[PDB]
Amino acid sequence: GSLNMPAYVKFNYMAEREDELSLIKGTKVIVMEKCSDGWWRGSYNGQVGWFPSNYVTEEGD
């Protein structure tokens, strides 16, 4: 399933709003929630929120 799943950031993604999650190429986020579409919900040391699935590496491909 999806519980505390580590995901490595693919590309730099600037979070615009409060519930958006900023991503840095090279870093890793903790994925908890993953929807049926491109909006996933994970925590990046400091804040939690929504990030695009196309911008994260679950583990490989």
Side-chain angles (χ1 to χ4, degrees):
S2 181
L3 182 60
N4 295 331
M5 187 179 185
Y8 311 126
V9 177
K10 276 282 183 69
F11 300 105
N12 278 28
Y13 174 76
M14 293 69 179
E16 182 71 334
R17 290 158 296 174
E18 182 192 295
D19 63 297
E20 283 180 77
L21 195 266
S22 53
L23 301 185
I24 296 298
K25 178 182 179 184
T27 62
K28 179 192 66 282
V29 316
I30 302 297
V31 185
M32 290 162 300
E33 186 70 87
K34 303 195 308 195
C35 310
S36 43
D37 61 278
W39 283 114
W40 288 0
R41 241 237 304 136
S43 151
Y44 173 69
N45 286 91
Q47 288 183 30
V48 80
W50 300 86
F51 66 85
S53 49
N54 294 334
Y55 285 70
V56 291
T57 298
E58 297 175 280
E59 208 296 87
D61 181 69

